[PDB]
Design a protein around this ligand. Structure first.
Ligand SMILES: *[C@@H]1O[C@H](CO)[C@@H](O[C@@H]2O[C@H](CO)[C@@H](O[C@@H]3O[C@H](CO)[C@@H](O[C@H]4O[C@H](CO)[C@@H](O)[C@H](O)[C@@H]4O)[C@H](O)[C@@H]3O)[C@H](O)[C@H]2NC(C)=O)[C@H](O)[C@H]1NC(C)=O
Ligand SMILES: *[C@@H]1O[C@H](CO)[C@@H](O[C@@H]2O[C@H](CO)[C@@H](O[C@@H]3O[C@H](CO)[C@@H](O)[C@H](O)[C@@H]3O)[C@H](O)[C@H]2NC(C)=O)[C@H](O)[C@H]1NC(C)=O
Ligand SMILES: *[C@@H]1O[C@H](CO)[C@@H](O[C@@H]2O[C@H](CO)[C@@H](O)[C@H](O)[C@H]2NC(C)=O)[C@H](O)[C@H]1NC(C)=O
Lengths: 99, 240, 290, 196
């Protein structure tokens, strides 16, 4: 309704193909706080996805951090899909390791 | 500051009849309440209001509705009357800036009847004291009876020399049934008044026994033979 | 000025029937408490979260807050009744209550309430107050809430005495976690620019704690003023991520390095050179089909 | 029920003290207050208690409150006959007008008069309008004696009733029975020195 969410998808450690890592999806600046966040591997939803407790910065804006255990590779695709009232259709953001 | 007044004092309604009861306050209170008192139970909130157009449901909100037309008035309406129920409805007004400033109305008394054919006014008789009590106690007890009235929507009062009296007076706290075996049975009521012998002995001291019956009106019109059992005063008299 | 204690409340009212209130508590950048709407007890998120409060002291607070949550939820449900057309559902309320702790005995306390996203009310001194630019209709709810002298006393007790006392103990208790040093780990990457024959150089810095870091692009001692620092993003393990970019023309990459300065390193600044032995070898392990 | 008053009914000798109490489970417990509801009328405030350990007193009514024990007592000093009424205890769960009141069932108080000089007697009272009807008033009987409503349909009898001549300091109990005179009160255990 009010503010549209901002999705950042980064890894915990430098990505090495075949070596296990942590993917993080940082979602901010949305309002109301009701939001749906899913991390996907090759379109398919990743099952065990851990979520931080929803909080909000000094500017009153919300932030929530989703993160999952993953193994990066050349062919496999990773994304973060967000459903929020402010948006007509869900926002899918792909992990780009070079930025 | 003023008064919170309910209307009517007493109410007669038939099984299924939609009754309404108004409450007006001049306290300049924004919050208004309609409660229901049941014997052996605490006051239960039906509806409340924060001012004109606001009607918020209580716990006993079922079978009723409220209408707050203006700050001054709150109005409760019983959607349908229950078979042969008897109820008390209490109005209260409250300060929006002082939780502890609550003022209450004197209550409305409801009586649901089978047929208005059952509604009868009281027949009031004064009994002059015993010449036996004056020669013994030197105290004269005028006695009064109010019999054959339905419902017990009555107000008895003693009057000497045109002025109402409370000293030496005693009225029954509860009325006596005529036929307790039948439902909607006529009632009896007694009231004593004691004055000094010297006072009663004087035939220039006038004693009047007033009874206010709260019966029917233009609204609540019947088609029976004998005179309407309307609201009236039926009073008896004596001198000595 | 050093550590800020924040108790964050997030209450959502969808209508007359549906509500939910959730909280998180922050000592600086570390969360100490978590209170779900489904949990009837405040949950500790660090082993030192009770601070130096006794079990009976803590229990008295938890019970205080337990009672408050149910009271607050209804009081709003009632204020929507009272405020009929001026405001209605869906309603969103945020509360920020806490201490900013300074050296010695120095402390400043606060209680701020945001309505529907905007900051509108603060508890100031001994009463609730609207703040500049608040909707006019808030005057009646404030006049109504300020009628309650018990809440005022309870709140004054917390902000003035309890919160500073609590957080002073909280600081001693958690010293090992608060004063921690985590070394950042940097790695370079690159992507094309909007412009033709232009590249953007990304320098990734991750896993550092505390938050203050310096990340610059260099060409000798020459700090590349074109460097654009990103916004600090958190990691799950209570550490930080940041990335610094530089827009270059193809071939200007040779000689450039990413310099990282941090407290954990101890004067041993990370110098990461574009095209270094490690860069090449680290780049081989991170290849994909885009 | 969250507010409970004790006892359901209380009998006190006139001129004595009355102690009615109320325990509650209402939370929060902002304030407690007592009302007196006169037989067939509305509710009248007597006192409001606000502090954790409060004591307040309006005229002859006095009250206490231990918000920890969640208990409050009402004290009527020098019980007058005019104190015969239901006493209702109410708890307000908030300080603002956003709160709600919780009402106890009430304690019915009955104040027996102090009949200092008894003279039990039942007299026949002739009607004002004519010879018939007739009625019999059993009066001046002690506080101890109690009136019984006989089984019979023909004779209707009322319960004990106090009157008070204020510029006399005089008080007398009474009972009324109508259609036989000496037989009117036979089901009630009448005193042996009853005049006729
Ligand atoms: C946020 O937290 C609040 C506190 O944790 C939640 O509020 C409470 O929610 C519960 C459950 O919704 C409320 O109690 C319910 O009362 C019902 C009866 O009135 C119970 O129903 C049961 O009986 C019926 C038959 O009569 C069955 O058909 C039914 O299946 C069921 O077994 C419920 O089981 C339950 O007790 C309670 O009143 C609320 N308390 C307060 C203080 O408001 C709130 O919902 C939470 N919000 C969300 C969205 O999670
Ligand atoms: C908790 O701390 C607050 C401060 O944030 C205290 O508020 C201050 O309390 C004093 C009374 O002790 C207030 O009263 C007086 O104000 C007048 C001016 O209006 C001034 O002339 C007096 O000298 C006196 O200060 C004062 O207004 C108030 N300050 C603010 C900022 O509102 C509060 O009382 C403390 N409570 C407890 C329980 O410790
Ligand atoms: C009050 O709001 C809640 C949340 O918006 C409503 O709950 C939803 O109910 C619909 C069906 O009516 C479901 O499809 C949703 O999944 C529910 N949401 C949640 C979060 O449980 C509720 O119906 C609303 N009440 C009214 C009276 O409209």
């Amino acid at each position: 309704i009010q503010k549209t969410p901002q999705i950042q998808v980064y890894s915990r450690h430098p990505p090495e193909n075949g070596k296990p890592n942590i993917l993080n999806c940082y979602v901010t600046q949305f309002h109301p706080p009701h939001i749906e966040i899913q991390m996907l591997k090759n379109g398919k939803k990743i099952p065990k996805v851990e979520m931080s407790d929803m909080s909000f910065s000094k500017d009153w804006s919300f932030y929530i951090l989703a993160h999952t255990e993953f193994t990066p590779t050349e062919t496999d695709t990773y994304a973060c899909r967000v459903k929020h009232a402010s948006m007509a259709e869900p926002k899918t953001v792909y992990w780009d390791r070079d930025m | 500051g003023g008064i919170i007044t309910q209307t009517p004092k007493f109410l007669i309604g038939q099984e299924g009849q939609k009754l309404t009861l108004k409450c007006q306050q001049n306290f300049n209170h924004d919050t208004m309440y309609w409660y229901r008192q049941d014997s052996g139970k605490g006051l239960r909130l039906i509806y409340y209001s924060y001012g004109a157009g606001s009607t918020e449901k209580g716990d006993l909100s079922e079978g009723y509705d409220a209408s707050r037309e203006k700050k001054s008035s709150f109005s409760l309406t019983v959607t349908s009357a229950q078979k042969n129920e008897m109820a008390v409805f209490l109005c209260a007004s409250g300060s929006l800036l002082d939780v502890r400033e609550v003022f209450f109305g004197k209550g409305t008394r409801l009586t649901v009847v089978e047929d208005l054919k059952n509604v009868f006014p009281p027949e009031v008789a004064v009994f002059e004291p015993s010449e036996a009590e004056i020669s013994h106690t030197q105290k004269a007890t005028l006695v009064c009876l109010a019999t054959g009235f339905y419902p017990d929507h009555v107000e008895l009062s003693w009057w000497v020399n045109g002025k109402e009296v409370h000293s030496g007076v005693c009225t029954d706290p509860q009325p006596l049934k005529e036929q307790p075996a039948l439902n909607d049975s006529r009632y009896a009521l007694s009231s004593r008044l004691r004055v000094s012998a010297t006072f009663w002995q004087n035939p220039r001291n006038h004693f009047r026994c007033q009874v206010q019956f709260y019966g029917l009106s233009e609204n609540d019109e019947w088609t029976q033979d004998r005179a309407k059992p309307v609201t009236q005063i039926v009073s008896a008299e004596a001198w000595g | 000025k050093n550590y800020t204690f924040r108790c964050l409340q997030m209450s959502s009212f969808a209508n007359r029937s549906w509500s939910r209130t959730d909280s998180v508590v922050w000592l600086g950048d570390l969360q100490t408490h978590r209170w779900s709407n489904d949990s009837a007890t405040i949950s500790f998120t660090k082993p030192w979260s009770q601070g130096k409060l006794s079990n009976q002291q803590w229990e008295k607070l938890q019970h205080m807050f337990q009672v408050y949550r149910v009271s607050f939820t209804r009081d709003i449900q009632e204020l929507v009744k009272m405020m009929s057309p001026k405001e209605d559902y869906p309603i969103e309320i945020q509360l920020s209550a806490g201490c900013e702790m300074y050296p010695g005995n120095a402390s400043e306390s606060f209680l701020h309430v945001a309505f529907q996203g905007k900051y509108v009310v603060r508890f100031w001194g001994t009463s609730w107050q609207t703040v500049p630019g608040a909707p006019s209709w808030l005057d009646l709810p404030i006049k109504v809430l300020n009628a309650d002298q018990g809440t005022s006393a309870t709140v004054q007790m917390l902000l003035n005495d309890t919160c500073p006392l609590f957080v002073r103990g909280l600081l001693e208790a958690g010293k090992s976690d608060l004063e921690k040093q985590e070394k950042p780990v940097a790695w370079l990457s690159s992507v094309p620019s909007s412009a033709h024959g232009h590249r953007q150089l990304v320098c990734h810095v991750s896993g550092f704690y505390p938050k203050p870091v310096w990340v610059m692009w260099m060409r000798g001692d020459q700090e590349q003023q074109g460097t654009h620092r990103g916004d600090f993003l958190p990691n799950a393990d209570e550490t930080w991520y940041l990335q610094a970019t530089l827009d270059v023309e193809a071939g200007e990459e040779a000689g450039l390095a990413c310099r990282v300065k941090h407290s954990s390193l101890g004067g041993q600044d990370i110098i990461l050179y574009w095209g270094s032995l490690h860069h090449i070898l680290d780049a081989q392990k991170m290849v994909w089909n885009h | 029920t969250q507010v409970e008053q004790s006892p359901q009914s209380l009998v006190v000798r006139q001129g004595e003290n009355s102690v009615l109490q109320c325990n509650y489970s209402v939370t929060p417990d902002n304030h407690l207050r007592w009302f007196k509801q006169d037989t067939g009328k509305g509710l009248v405030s007597l006192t409001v208690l606000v502090d954790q350990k409060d004591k307040t007193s309006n005229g002859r009514y006095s009250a206490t409150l231990d918000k920890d024990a969640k208990h409050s007592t009402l004290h009527i000093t020098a019980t007058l006959l005019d104190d015969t009424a239901t006493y209702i205890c109410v708890v307000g769960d908030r300080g603002s007008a956003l709160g709600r009141l919780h009402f106890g069932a009430g304690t019915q108080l009955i104040v027996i008069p102090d009949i200092q000089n008894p003279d039990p007697a039942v007299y026949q009272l002739r009607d004002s309008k004519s010879s018939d009807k007739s009625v019999c008033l059993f009066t001046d009987f002690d506080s101890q004696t109690n009136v019984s409503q006989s089984k019979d349909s023909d004779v209707y009898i009322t319960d004990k009733c106090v009157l008070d001549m204020r510029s006399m300091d005089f008080k007398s109990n009474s009972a009324v029975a109508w259609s036989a005179c000496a037989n009117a009160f036979n089901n009630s255990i009448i005193p042996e020195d009853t005049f006729f």
